[PDB]
A paper describes a structure:
One mechanism by which phages and other mobile genetic elements are able to overcome the CRISPR-Cas system is through the expression of anti-CRISPR proteins. We previously reported that gene 34 from Pseudomonas phage JBD5, which encodes the protein AcrE1, shows anti-CRISPR activity against the type I-E system of P. aeruginosa strain SMC4386 (4). We show that AcrE1 binds to the CRISPR-associated helicase/nuclease Cas3 and that the C-terminal region of the anti-CRISPR protein is important for its inhibitory activity. In summary, these experiments demonstrate that AcrE1 functions by blocking the activity of Cas3 without inhibiting the DNA-binding activity of Cascade.
Here, we report the 2.5-Å-resolution crystal structure of anti-CRISPR protein AcrE1, which inhibits the type I-E CRISPR-Cas system of P. aeruginosa. (a) Crystal structure of the C-terminal 6×His-tagged AcrE1 solved by Br-SAD reveals a predominantly helical dimeric protein. AcrE1 displays an elongated dimeric structure. Each monomer is predominantly comprised of three helices. Helix 1 (residues 5 to 17) is followed by a tight turn leading into the very long helix 2 (residues 21 to 57). A short turn at the end of helix 2 leads into helix 3 (residues 62 to 80), which terminates close enough to the beginning of helix 1 for a potential H-bond to form between the carbonyl O of Val79 and the amide N of Leu5. Residues 82 to 90 form an antiparallel β-sheet that protrudes at a 90° angle from the end of helix 3. The final 10 residues of AcrE1 are likely disordered, as they were not well defined in the electron density map and could not be modeled into the structure. The large dimeric interface is composed primarily of 18 hydrophobic residues from each monomer that are greater than 97% buried, forming a single hydrophobic core that spans the entire length of the helices. The structure of AcrE1 is not similar to other previously determined anti-CRISPR proteins, and searches using the Dali server did not reveal structural similarity to any other protein.
Author numbering:
A (entry chain A): 1 to 96
B (entry chain B): 1 to 92
Write the structure that this text describes.
Amino acid sequence: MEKKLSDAQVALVAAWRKYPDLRESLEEAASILSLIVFQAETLSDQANELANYIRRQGLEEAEGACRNIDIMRAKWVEVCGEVNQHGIRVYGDAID
Amino acid sequence: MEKKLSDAQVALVAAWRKYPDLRESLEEAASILSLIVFQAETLSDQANELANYIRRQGLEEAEGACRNIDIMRAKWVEVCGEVNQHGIRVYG
Ligand SMILES: [Br-]
Ligand SMILES: [Br-]
Ligand SMILES: [Br-]
Ligand SMILES: [Br-]
């Protein structure tokens, strides 16, 4: 349960497997987690694209912020992984 | 549930209320969710700043991207709320 998105999803499934009365509750909760992750990944992609633009234009004044974004995105993938081309969220060295 | 970060957090708490053995489990889960909300808001703020820079430079090429960041930030606040000046996450 080492701080990965997969652990939190797994723990919620486990609970409504032990106690089926929790299923509606905790499934709406997993749905919200999923929506939160989705929205974050949408904005993150937009920010990355904006950073690509700033670099392509040789706009060096904003380079620090563009680096920050890289680090933040890299930190995100450590916790949440990355959805591959087949639409499956994968982690670690299963990414490359 | 109204599909808000707060509604989801409660469902997690409520569950280990009915069933205390779930507590280590679901609270670790809540920890991960909070970390996720935190990391997303850190990046979001940074992105907003980048858009601010681009708007102070009058660069109309990237303006669509800036309007996009604004739209998705407003949507974020719909689900996750927003921390007011007193350190309390509030919704609307
Ligand atoms: Br939270
Ligand atoms: Br962090
Ligand atoms: Br600026
Ligand atoms: Br509120």
